Amino acid sequence: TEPSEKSVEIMRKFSEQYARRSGTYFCVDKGVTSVVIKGLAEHKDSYGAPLCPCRHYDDKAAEVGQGFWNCPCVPMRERKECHCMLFLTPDNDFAGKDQTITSDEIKETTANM
Amino acid sequence: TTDIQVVNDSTWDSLVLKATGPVVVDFWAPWCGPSKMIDPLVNDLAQHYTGKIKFYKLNTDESPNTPGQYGVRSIPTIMIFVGGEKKDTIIGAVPKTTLTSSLDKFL
Amino acid sequence: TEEDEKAKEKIGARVRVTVPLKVYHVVRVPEVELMGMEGFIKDYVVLWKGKKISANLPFKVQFVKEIEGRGPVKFFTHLKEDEFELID
Ligand code: SF4
Ligand code: NA
Ligand code: NA
């Protein structure tokens, strides 16, 4: 149920790198950021790809194979739309000013979850 | 505090479809950030509408068949039921005023 | 499968984008406005190797756009049914 720290650290480093590269910022609620990253890590553990954690699927193996919802999802790559509020454009009312999130931030924010 | 009642695939028929009066169901998932950020809002509205609207929470990971039946895709999703029929659908984190207004239409 | 069979028929048909929409994945073109551009549907990506996918932008549409100094760049973008019109 809980993702390994190897997958969390991979997805944490990807999200920092994808945020600068897309010109997007993490949400002012950094709990959203940490939770979503952990959800990507858990899906990567169970299916080998970071399937989106804010979608419900009928066939997760098929979704991973087609790739539409493998993070970064098609909507984020093409339209910069991220509905898990992981990558937010600066004009978003919930966009913060950080493009970094330390592994310590994820550990204290997701504590007792 | 009394936390919002859980609903599952096994209990969907008896708790939601056969209920009297409006029923609100919050479709959530344990690792969906936006679903956790509206949790205090849904707890707030459950208190505001006590005795007038019944609230349930459904973990789409532990009860996958109900969201599959109703086309729940993006999480969070809030759906309102009356007499066993879907009457409204609110997708994503929304502000309190949007939720109050949609819920008010069911008295 | 009566909306999937209706959608499958549109594969290969020519379309035009009817709503303002900007995309950021065209290679070495940082931003492209797609309002008014014409292309054709190359796939209905909801269907994949006999299985069904929950894609919210199900129509993979091929576009070619003329770039000054470089020549026509070919790219794909996924669209919804209400974001384009069919041509003739
Ligand atoms: S919505 Fe797309 S980009 Fe955002 S976290 Fe989910 S898969 Fe990644
Ligand atoms: Na974020
Ligand atoms: Na039941």
* Residue boundaries of the structural domains of chain B: 5-105
Q: Which CATH number fits domain C2-86: 2.40.50.140, 2.30.30.50, 3.40.50.300, 3.40.50.970?
A: 2.30.30.50
Give the integer Cα–Cα distance in Å for B91 and B73.
Answer: 9
Contacts of A56 in chain C (CB under 8 A): 54
Backbone phi and psi for residue A80, each to the nearest 5 degrees, phi listed first: 55, 30
C53–A63 CB contact, under 8 Å? yes
Q: Which CATH number fits domain B5-105: 3.40.30.10, 3.60.15.10, 3.10.20.600, 3.40.50.970?
A: 3.40.30.10
Identify which of B86, B85, B74, B84 has the alpha carbon closest to the alpha carbon of residue B38: B74
C 5-44: CB under 8 A from A: 21-25
Resolution of this deposited model, Å: 2.4
- List C-alpha distances in Å: A29 to A63, A100, B71, C50: 29, 13, 28, 40
Please state, as a whole number, how many other Cβ atoms lie within 10 Å of the Cβ of residue B89.
Answer: 14
- List C-alpha distances in Å: A7 to A22, A36, B55, C44: 22, 13, 35, 32
Burial of B14 (0-12, 13-18, 19+ CB in 10 A): exposed
Residues, CB-to-ion distance under 5 Å, ligand 2: A 26-27, 33, 86
Give the integer Cα–Cα distance in Å for B83 and B21.
Answer: 7
- Residue B47 one-letter amino acid: Q
A56–B33 CB contact, under 8 Å? no
- Residue A15's domain spans which residues? 5-110
Backbone phi and psi for residue C84, each to the nearest 5 degrees, phi listed first: -145, 160
Name the domain count of chain A. 1
A35 lines ligand 1 (CB under 6 A): no
Give the integer Cα–Cα distance in Å for B92 and A54.
Answer: 10
The reply to whether C54 touches chain B by the CB within 8 Å rule is yes
Sequence ranges of the domains in chain C: 2-86
CATH of the domain at A72: 3.90.460.10
Query: What string of H, E and C letters represents the secondary structure of chain C?
Result: CHHHHHHHHCCCCEEEECCCCEECCCCCCCCEECCCCEEEEEEECCEECCEECCCCCCEEEEEEEEECCCEEEEEEEEECHHHEEECC
Asked if B31 and A32 touch (Cβ cutoff 8 Å), the reply is no
Identify which of B14, B29, B12 has the alpha carbon closest to the alpha carbon of residue B72: B29
Please state, as a whole number, how many other Cβ atoms lie within 10 Å of the Cβ of residue C42.
Answer: 14
Burial of C37 (0-12, 13-18, 19+ CB in 10 A): middle
- Rg value, chain C, Cα: 14
B31–A38 CB contact, under 8 Å? yes
- Bond before A72 cis per omega within 30 degrees: yes
Centroid of ligand 3 to alpha carbon of B29 (angstroms): 21
Q: How many A×B Cβ pairs under 8 Å?
A: 64
The reply to whether C54 touches chain A by the CB within 8 Å rule is yes
Backbone phi and psi for residue B32, each to the nearest 5 degrees, phi listed first: -100, 110
**Sequence-ordered list of residues with C-beta below 8 angstroms from that of B57, at least 6 positions apart, any chain:** B4, B5, B6, B7, B25, B26, B28, B42
